[PDB]
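Dataset card, provenance and construction

Sequences and ligand SMILES were collected as paired inputs. For each pair, a complete structure of the chain with the small molecule in place was predicted and serialized as C-alpha cells. The example below shows a pair involving dodecane-trimethylamine. Curators did not alter the output after generation; any descriptive sentences attached to a record were derived from the structure itself.
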Amino acid sequence: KSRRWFHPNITGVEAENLLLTRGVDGSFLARPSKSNPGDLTLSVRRNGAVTHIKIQNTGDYYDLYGGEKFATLAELVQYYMEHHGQLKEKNGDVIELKYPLNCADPTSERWFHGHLSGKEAEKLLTEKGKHGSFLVRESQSHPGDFVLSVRTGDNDGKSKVTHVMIRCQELKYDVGGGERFDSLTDLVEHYKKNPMVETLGTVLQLKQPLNTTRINAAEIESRVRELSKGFWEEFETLQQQECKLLYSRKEGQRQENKNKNRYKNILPFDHTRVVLHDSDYINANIIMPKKSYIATQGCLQNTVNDFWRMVFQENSRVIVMTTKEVERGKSKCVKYWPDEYALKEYGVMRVRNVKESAAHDYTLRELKLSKVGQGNTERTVWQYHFRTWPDHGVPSDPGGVLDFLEEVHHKQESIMDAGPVVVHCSAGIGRTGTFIVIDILIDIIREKGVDCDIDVPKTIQMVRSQRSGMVQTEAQYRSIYMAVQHYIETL
Ligand SMILES: CCCCCCCCCCCC[N+](C)(C)C
C-alpha cells in the first residue's frame, strides 16, 4: 500500500468526482478531512455512489468509524484489502476496498521541491548531496515544465550536477522523447529503475532524494520558526513513507495471543517483538536506535505476569509510564505494582513497592523485583509514572517534561548494566513513540554537543520500522521539535 491512495490536498467534492469519473465500484482513496484536523476520511465507491468513512486519531491510534483501531493508515488499508465483509456501512453493509485510486500530486514526495532555482538546486546538491542524490523542481524557464537535477559523483568524488528537462504536455510528462507518464512520480519511478544514460557514458542514477529535513541542532529555533508559519507538510511527507513498514506481525495474530493484545490490530513486528524464554509472547518491541527501549502497551489483567517476566528477562531497571490507569472512564493500564510497602507475587515474579516519591507531574516508585524461590536474583526497578499528560493533545510546558526526562535519563545512566528502558502508554505507540523519539534526539545532543546534526522525520521513520505507528499525531510531531528546542535553548 504505497500511500498513492492518500491524496494530501483534495476536497470532499473533488474526491467524489475522482471516484465517480476515474474510478469503479470498490475504488477508494484516503484524504485529510476538513471537518477537523487530525481526522482522515476514507472515501469509497459502491453501487455507483460514493460513501465517506471517518477516521479519528487523537494521539493513541487510528479509530475507524464503525470499524477497528489501527497503528497506521497503511496497516488499516492493508487489513481491509485482505478482509472483505469486515468493513461495514450502516450495520452489516459490507463496504469493499478493492482498487486504490492513486494520486498524481508530487507534493509529499521526498524528491519534489518546486519553487526552486537551478543554481539553488546546485547549492543544495553540492551542500548536502552525494552520488545519486536527486530532486525535481519547477522550471523557472518554461512555466509548467519541471527539472530533474541529479548529483553524479565519485571519498565520494564530488564531481557533477546534471539537469534534465521534464516537459509537461496535455497533462503528461516526458524527458524529451520516449514514454509519456501520467505523473511526476511515475516518471521518477521509471527512471529510478531505468537510469537515463548520457551520450558519453555517464549513468544518471536516481538513488536517494535530496535531504531537506536534517538540521544543525544549534539552529533548531530558526527551523521551528520556518515551520511554524509547514510542520504539517513535513509530517505528511513522513506519513507517505509508512507503506515501506508493513512488516509481518504473525505471532501477535495467533489464536493463543489474541487476547494478550489491548487492541486486536495493533501488534508488534515479528522481527523486533520481545520474545519471552521463561509461552513466549508480549505486545512489546525492542527499540534499538547504547541506551535501548522496550516500547509496550499498558498491562491487561492477563498480561501483568508476562510484563514482569519481560522486565526480569530483559534486565530492565527503569520503567516510564505515560498514562493514568484510567482516563475518560476507560482503562489504559491495569495496576501492575503493589501499594507502597506491600509485597506481591505476579506468577513466578515477586515485587515489593519499597517507597513512593510524589512530584507534581509524576510519581516515582522504587520496586524490588525477584524470582520467587531464588534469592539474589533481586534488582531494583524504578517506575517513573508520569501522571499529567492532558486528555487532549500534548503537554504545554517543556520545563516539566524535560525535568522528568532528565531525571529518568540520569537514573538509567547511574545503574551498571541496566537493560532497555521500558516505556508504555495505552496502545504503546503514540505517547510512547513520542517520549522515546525525544529521548533519542536529546541523547544525541547530550553526547555530540549542540553542534551535531539531527533529523526528526528520519529518526521517527527509523523507530517506526521497529514498532508500528511510533508517533501518532501532528501535535506530537511538533511537540518533538518544541522539546528539543527548549532543551537546546536551556543550554
Ligand atoms: C508548547 C510547547 C509544547 C512542548 C511539548 C513537550 C513534549 C511533549 C511530549 C513529550 C512528553 C514526554 N513525557 C511528558 C512523558 C516526558
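Derived descriptions for this record:
The chain is about 25% helix and 25% strand.
The two ends are 43 Å apart (CA to CA).
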